[PDB]
């Protein structure tokens, strides 16, 4: 699940068809869980501060259920999409936090998605 | 370069499936002796951890050739450890990129 998620988020950032996988379609359905106004706000702040800081702060918030985890995947995905490929983000730091929160739900997320 | 490298190492581990980019990166494999990888894999298995890999990656990088080796050692370990291996790859990337980040520009030039 770790690999698939790293791959999906990076793909959401550059949208390189060379690195596309069919398991991304199911993950993309989680986008409905995130309001675009929240993303707009988050992106604006990232740009305001010239950092991944605001993203990392959002990812550092508690995950108490699978729906919380699904949201975190989707917020990462939409931020990755909207921030642009030129964006010099140390993605591994975001993955560190994301997986620290969602890791436990991997098995159940695998079930819920496939 | 960060993205390409994350993609290459993960691909080396398990085959997602193809571009020219990975071909150039694969040429760096000659820099790493397979006996060193065999040893590293053996230790990882002995300890049931990425610990030995992380220890290798935490060693100093003083030139581009040092950086090229680190990419290749990561690649061959990724290959030889197997897909089933529950490795927190992001921790390896954290250390790898902490060492090699400065060389990204020159590595981009040297490879393409």
For chain A, which residues make up each domain, given as ranges? Answer: 1-114
CB within 8 Å: B7 and A19: yes
Element (H, E) at A92: helix A91-102
The SS3 assignment for A74 reads: helix
Q: Do B14 and A3 touch (CB under 8 A)?
A: yes
**Joined tokens for residue B88:** 């927190």
Upper half-sphere CA count for residue A2 (Cβ side, 13 Å): 22
Query: In which element (H, E) is residue A100 found?
Result: helix A91-102
d(CA A65, CA A86): 34
What gap in Å lies between CA B109 and CA B112, rounded to an integer?
5
d(C-alpha B35, C-alpha B29), whole Å: 13
Q: Which residues of A50-61 are buried (b: 16+ CB within 10 A; e: fewer)?
A: eebebbbebbee
Closest-CA residue of B relative to A88 is B2
The span from the CA of A95 to the CA of B69, in Å, is 25
**Rounded Cα gap, residues A26 and B80, in angstroms:** 30
CATH domain A1-114 topology: Apoptosis Regulator Bcl-x (1.10.437)
Joined together, the tokens standing for residue A88 give 């010099």
DSSP secondary-structure letter at B83? T
Q: Is A88 exposed, middle or buried (0-12, 13-18, 19+ CB in 10 A)?
A: exposed
Token pair 């250390």 in the structure block, residue: B95
User: What DSSP state is assigned to residue A63?
Assistant: -
By what technique were these coordinates determined? X-ray
**Torsion sign, CA atoms A86, A10, A59, B53:** negative
Q: Are A114 and A23 a contacting pair, CB within 8 Å?
A: yes
- All residues of chain A having their beta carbon less than 8 Å from the beta carbon of residue B88 are 2, 99
As a whole number of angstroms, the distance between CA B78 and CA B99 comes to 18
**Data resolution in angstroms:** 3.1
Of the CATH numbers 1.10.10.10, 1.10.437.20, 2.30.42.10, 3.30.565.60, which one belongs to the domain with range B1-112? 1.10.437.20
In chain A, residues with a C-beta closer than 8 Å to the C-beta of B93 are 92, 95
What is the distance between the alpha carbons of residues B111 and B105, in angstroms, rounded to a whole number?
10
For residue A35 the two structure tokens come to 């309001």
CB contact under 8 A, B6 and A10: yes
Is B89 within 8 Å of A3 when comparing Cβ atoms? yes
Query: Could you tell me which of B31, B111, B44, B28 has the C-alpha nearest to residue B77?
Result: B44
d(CA A12, CA B46): 37
Q: Which two tokens stand for residue B97?
A: 């990129």
Say how far residue B107 (Cα) sits from the centre of its chain: 14
Q: Tokens for A12, please give them.
A: 């959401």
Asked if residues A9 and A77 have their Cβ atoms less than 8 Å apart, the reply is: yes
Side-chain-side CA neighbours of B22 within 13 Å: the count stands at: 15
């Amino acid at each position: 699940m770790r690999t698939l998620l790293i791959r999906y988020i990076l793909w959401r950032n550059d949208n390189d068809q060379t690195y596309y996988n069919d398991d991304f379609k199911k993950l993309m359905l989680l986008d409905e869980l995130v309001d675009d106004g929240d993303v707009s706000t988050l992106i604006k702040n990232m740009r305001m501060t010239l950092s991944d800081g605001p993203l990392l702060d959002r990812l550092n918030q508690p995950v108490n259920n699978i729906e919380d985890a699904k949201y975190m995947i989707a917020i990462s995905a939409k931020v990755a999409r909207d921030i642009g490929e030129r964006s010099e983000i140390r993605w591994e730091e975001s993955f560190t936090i994301l997986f620290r929160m969602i890791e436990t739900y991997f098995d159940d997320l695998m079930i819920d998605l496939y």
